[PDB]
Ligand binder design. Structure first.
Ligand SMILES: [Cl-]
Lengths: 189, 203
C-alpha cells in the first residue's frame, strides 16, 4: 500500500546510498592500485510480507546490504573500514563466519544506525550490512531462492544444503591457504 | 595531471558524485510525494587542475592553504524554475545534517555590475575515504535557467576577453542580461498561478 511505501521510503533511500558508498570503497582501492577487500555489493529492502510475520526499532535488517569479498581474511579489513566511517554508527556485530548457522549459512553481520536526509528532515534508521565471501554468497543466494520457492524443506533437503555449505567453506579455507602459500613462498624463502 | 594531483582531487570527485545524487534525490522526493520539484536540473564538476592553478596565482593561494581558501574545487549547479524558488532550496540545504553551510552569497538581490545573477552556498562536506574521513569545501550555486544561460555564456566569453569585451559583444551581454532578468521578473509576476496549476498534475 501507500502507507507501507511511506514507512519504507527512508530504508529504500538508505540502501541506495549505502550501495553507492560501499561500491566506492572498491573504486578507491583500485584507483590507488591495491587489492580491494570488496568485490561487489548488493542490497534490498525486506519485502512487506517478510517483515509482517517477524514482529512482536530492533528489527535490524529492513535495510540489508551484502558486501562480497574474495577471502575470509578480507572480512575484518571491511569491518575496520566500517568502524572508521563517519556516516554510520556500529550498533551490533555478529560473527556467523567463525560460528555458522545451523543451515550452513556463514556471514559477518554489522548493524548500524544510518541517517538519511529527506525534504522532511533527517531520519535515522537501522541497516544490516552482511559481509561474506564469494563462496558463502554462492551458497546463500541459492539456498535463499530454493527456500522462497518452497514452503519448510524436508529434512533430507535441509541436510544436503548443509553439506554443500560445509564444502563451500572448505573451499574458502583452501583458497585462503593457496593465497597464503603463494605470499609465504616469497616472503620467508 | 600527476599522482599528487590525483590523490588531492579524489575526495572532491567523490564529493561531487555524492552531492549530485543527493541533490537529484531531493527532486525525486518531491515527485514521489506527488509534488512539483523546485529543482529541475542538477549538474556538478571538479575544477580542472589548470583552473585551480590559475585561481591560486590570482588569489595568492599556496598548496598548503588550497583546500581552505578555494571554495569551489567541488562545484554543484542547481537549476530552479523561479527566482523565488532559490530560497526554498536554500531552506532544504539548511535542514541537512550531512553538510554545514558556512557562507551564502546573494547575487540575485545584489546583482553584479555585469548583469550576473546567481546564489552561492558554500558548504563543508565530509567524505568517507579508505584513508579516513576527509572534510572539503563545496560550492552549490542555485540558478534559474535564464540566469544559467546568461552566466555560462558570460563566463565562456570572459575566459577569452577577461573583462575586455569587444563593444559589440558587451552591448549584447548587457541587453541579454536585461532580457534574462526581465524573463524571470515577468514570469515571477504569475508564479502563484503557475504553482497552483502545477500542484494539480505533475507528469
Ligand atoms: Cl539531472
Amino acid at each position: 500500500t501507500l502507507e507501507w511505501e511511506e514507512f519504507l521510503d527512508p530504508y529504500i533511500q538508505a540502501v541506495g546510498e549505502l550501495k553507492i558508498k560501499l561500491r566506492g570503497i572498491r573504486k578507491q582501492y583500485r584507483k590507488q592500485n591495491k587489492h580491494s577487500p570488496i568485490e561487489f555489493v548488493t542490497g534490498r529492502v525486506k519485502p512487506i510480507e517478510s517483515i509482517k510475520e517477524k514482529m512482536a526499532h530492533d528489527l535490524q535488517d529492513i535495510a540489508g546490504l551484502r558486501v562480497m569479498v574474495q577471502f575470509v581474511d578480507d572480512v575484518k579489513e571491511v569491518v575496520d573500514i566500517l568502524h572508521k566511517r563517519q556516516d554510520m554508527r556500529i550498533i551490533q556485530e555478529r560473527d556467523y563466519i567463525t560460528h555458522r548457522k545451523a543451515s550452513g549459512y556463514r556471514s559477518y553481520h554489522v548493524v548500524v544506525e544510518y541517517t538519511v536526509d529527506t525534504i522532511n528532515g533527517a531520519k535515522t534508521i537501522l541497516a544490516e550490512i552482511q559481509i561474506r565471501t564469494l563462496a558463502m554468497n554462492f551458497w546463500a543466494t541459492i539456498e535463499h531462492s530454493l527456500n522462497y520457492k518452497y514452503q519448510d524443506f524436508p529434512d533430507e533437503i535441509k541436510k544436503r544444503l548443509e553439506i554443500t555449505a560445509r564444502i563451500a567453506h572448505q573451499l574458502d579455507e583452501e583458497m585462503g591457504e593457496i593465497r597464503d602459500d603463494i605470499q609465504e613462498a616469497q616472503a620467508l624463502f
